[PDB]
Structure 1
Amino acid sequence: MSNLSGTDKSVILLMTIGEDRAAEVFKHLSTREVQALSTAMANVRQISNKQLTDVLSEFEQEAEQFAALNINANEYLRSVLVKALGEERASSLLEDILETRDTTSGIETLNFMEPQSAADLIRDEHPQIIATILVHLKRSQAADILALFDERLRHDVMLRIATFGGVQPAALAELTEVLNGLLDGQNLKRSKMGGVRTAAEIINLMKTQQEEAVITAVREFDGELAQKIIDEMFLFENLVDVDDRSIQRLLQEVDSESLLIALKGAEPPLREKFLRNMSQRAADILRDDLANRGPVRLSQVENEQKAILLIVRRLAETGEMVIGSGEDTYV
């Protein structure tokens, strides 16, 4: 039983399985292991029939003893989190867990840390150093960093990215060790807790005078921020709780095409709530149009929805309906 290293035995298995199966195994391997067995099959020697048989038999035993679970190890987490705690908390926990697999070098920490901090850190860096740093990072992160530099340095870094010639290994190792030493500060992970969609939730609560003053102040400070806050403030769900008379009034103001486009993205409960109030002919033709018209881009649906939201706001300012968080109890 010749001193057949386990790496070379794995190389034997990869050779025996086939090309597509080898690619499938490669897709589930880490980079260091990929390079290791790539070198192993680069300096591969001949394998005897008996040693081949022994290796593949012991691999059969290992596969039989270990094969279990591994159904959707990654997708299962996403599906369970989305089903249990909603999309936003699912994404938050997914980011938290996928961040637990730490970097080995600070260069990848530059990928996981806020773009403003990166721009502040590497602005003083050498333009070629900036180029080398930006190449290793994710494309979106590099774009975010570059969007903060001034025009001259940004153009210089872009030009150097275009004509990169290849960094020496020792210099790259020194740069990596410098980044590791500097980024050795315990944890960056600036907690995302709080922000938009929470301010609107708060504003939905207090007195009309206070909230109108607050939104006026925000609009004075920033019009787009105020518009976003107002848009999140209402949310296109509580129209089911604006009762039937509001729907009856609203259909006197909403065009048919905008309503038809908007109802495509609406939930079945909201669609039924809107349909069940008007005349049979109107509800029937609206349902037939909804079932007949083809799919429409989401942005157009949101545009029509925002138009009817403007209509709703202009009609509520007149007091023709009541928009209340408190559910209308019927006895």
Structure 2
Amino acid sequence: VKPFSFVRDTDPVQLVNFLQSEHPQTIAVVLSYLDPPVAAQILGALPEELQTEVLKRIALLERTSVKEIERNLEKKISGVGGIDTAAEIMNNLDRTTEKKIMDKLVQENPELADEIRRRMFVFEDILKLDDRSIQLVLREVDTRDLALALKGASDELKEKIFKNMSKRAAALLKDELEYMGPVRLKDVEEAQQKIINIIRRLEEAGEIVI
């Protein structure tokens, strides 16, 4: 079973009560093991002074120093946490708290802040992109992944994507949808994740405009 799994079984406040007086690092460890919405809920309820530091430690969980990297590597060779975890927690925080943590990271860890922000991109964020960028992305997506990803998108996002496809691609997509049928929710999920990865890569290449 997974560590800290008894957390959803534990009380609400007594939970924040104990974590409050623990070392930030110890806090980072416990939260990085929980479902993000749960972690975001706890994080936002922690004393303001711990929020940023704890979020940063979650982001750099086993990357804190060259020594830590060297040690962790050796373990895996012989016998959790990270940027994604942090970004997922930030997406589930209330806007206000999220903004405060991001503003501080921008000031003290500008790079890490940038890694987290870019990792925070969700499928609906595609609505933030301009039409040209969207077309750029579409050329990198196969018909089936697109169809799957769309079964989990808002009608508005559906539209903005459609009006940006080539006539031939749109026809192929429509065909897929017609003979696709019901699908496992997790397929819709990885399809969207796949498109998101394409976006994350196209911006690392500095060719994606918001």
For normalisation by structure 2, the TM-score amounts to 0.49
- Of structures 1 and 2, the one with the larger relative CO (CA 8 A, separation 6+) is 2
CA radius of gyration, larger in: 1
TM-score normalized by the length of structure 1 = 0.33
